[PDB]
Design a protein around this ligand. Structure first.
Ligand SMILES: NC(=O)c1cnc2c(ccn2CC(=O)NC2CCNCC2)c1
Ligand SMILES: NC(=O)c1cnc2c(ccn2CC(=O)NC2CCNCC2)c1
Lengths: 250, 250
């Protein structure tokens, strides 16, 4: 691979999926698409269906114990994983997305983003054999307490989230990076359905604008997500602005 | 529209996105793709870029107050929303996905799934003007405490999650529907890297298999996600099996 864009922290992500075409949604579009075109991110897919040997390329199998659903067939899925691990060489963490995994949050994104290589296994049907989790999976992660039709959308979600930490992908040490909700944002026009832009944001006063933003982030976190505040050791400035917002609310 | 598949609870989802092609990942593939082909789910996209009038089809705009990023331009985005609301007719809830929203979980999926119509607004850049949230958005939701490059992956995630509640989409009142983590699942072969299938699952004993599954779901929820247990009023059978697992662990 070749190019002028600095790629020191380039990330390689192997994906195991029965529907690799879904991943076009992050490789061909927007910020992630530009990351792939510039060689900051590489996403390489293996499809268990390509590791089958029967005439009908069977990728599901019946569960021991009955139950109404099927599981991913072990041999095609294991073979695909083994191919991806041989392509990745040494140091690739293998991740299984599922609702039984560790719950993803921005700190866990930045933990995962420290890996130069990841392999993401996407389950379909009722999931994968437990012994493959034991033998082939390093870590299990969830995007949230909800059930989807498969692990592709979780895997794409985790790719997108980690990609933002690759230097050069963005045009990061964000606002949510403070552990607070973002402040309100305003653009043209100055008046919209009779709602005006806060005068401070037109003031050109860079410090009063920084303070107002931080005070709105503290107020919104307190009102919407108060448990996120308990996670934080507020700065002296943060304590003061939060107290000011709570007095204005009351 | 026409077809033989029962579609009484068919869902219509309007999407506002600068990258509608991403939505091919759910409309053309798997369970969601079959839902769309069978007229159980309809996903219809509007792109703000199509509502621009300048020669360069501008969709971003500068934030009042400075800051390094841009915001979605109001006029194209507002026009797109208005078009989607006129297509949807009466009763469409408009949703904005963001990290400042209510945190999605399976109960909130089933709440959202009660709407026959939804419009999902996908933000890009530093987000949308606050006054559009006030004037055009009914509810703000998050998929999780992490930051992505835009609201498309959240919107697809929410589509997929709600789609599962549409009758006929699946081939539901699940296991996670108990509020518990799933039990281990096993398929062929009977022995894998010297790990055997639990004999109970080969026993053909339907009640002992149901009990073992439920006991593993309780043990795994207790060990991995103990706060999920505090949410539940366990059945007498559940209390007994949980106590049994906790004694075996100790
Ligand atoms: N929340 C996630 O990260 C998530 C959600 N669903 C996912 C994944 C990965 C795959 N699926 C499908 C799945 O696990 N379905 C089963 C749930 C328990 N009962 C059988 C169906 C991640
Ligand atoms: N968690 C979600 O549901 C989620 C995450 N990110 C999303 C969305 C929808 C859009 N984006 C991008 C975004 O909001 N980025 C900004 C975060 C605060 N600072 C400026 C960047 C949902």
């Amino acid at each position: 691979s070749s190019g002028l864009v600095p790629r020191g922290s380039h990330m390689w992500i192997g994906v195991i999926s029965l529907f690799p075409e879904m991943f076009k949604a992050i490789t061909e579009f927007g910020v992630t698409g530009r990351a792939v075109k510039h060689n900051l991110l590489k996403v390489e897919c293996w499809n268990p269906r390509d590791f089958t040997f029967d005439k009908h390329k069977t990728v599901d199998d019946r569960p021991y114990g009955g139950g109404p659903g099927m599981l991913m067939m072990v041999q095609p899925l294991r073979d695909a994983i083994h191919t991806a691990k041989a392509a990745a060489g040494e140091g690739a963490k293998v991740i299984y997305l599922s609702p039984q995994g560790r719950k993803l949050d921005q700190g866990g994104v930045t933990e995962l983003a420290q890996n130069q290589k990841l392999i993401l296994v996407c389950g379909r049907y009722e999931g994968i054999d437990e012994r493959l989790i034991q033998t082939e999976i390093d870590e299990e992660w969830s995007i949230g307490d909800y059930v989807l039709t498969g692990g592709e959308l979780p895997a794409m979600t985790l790719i997108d989230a980690v990609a933002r930490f690759i230097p050069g992908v963005l045009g990061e040490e964000d606002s949510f990076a403070d552990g607070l909700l973002d402040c309100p944002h305003y653009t043209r026009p100055e008046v919209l359905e009779g709602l005006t832009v806060p005068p401070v944001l037109m003031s050109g006063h860079h410090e009063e604008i920084r303070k107002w933003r931080l005070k709105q982030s503290l107020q919104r976190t307190w009102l919407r997500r108060p448990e996120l505040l308990e996670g934080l050791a507020l700065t002296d400035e943060q304590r003061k602005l939060l107290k000011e917002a709570q007095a204005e609310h009351n």
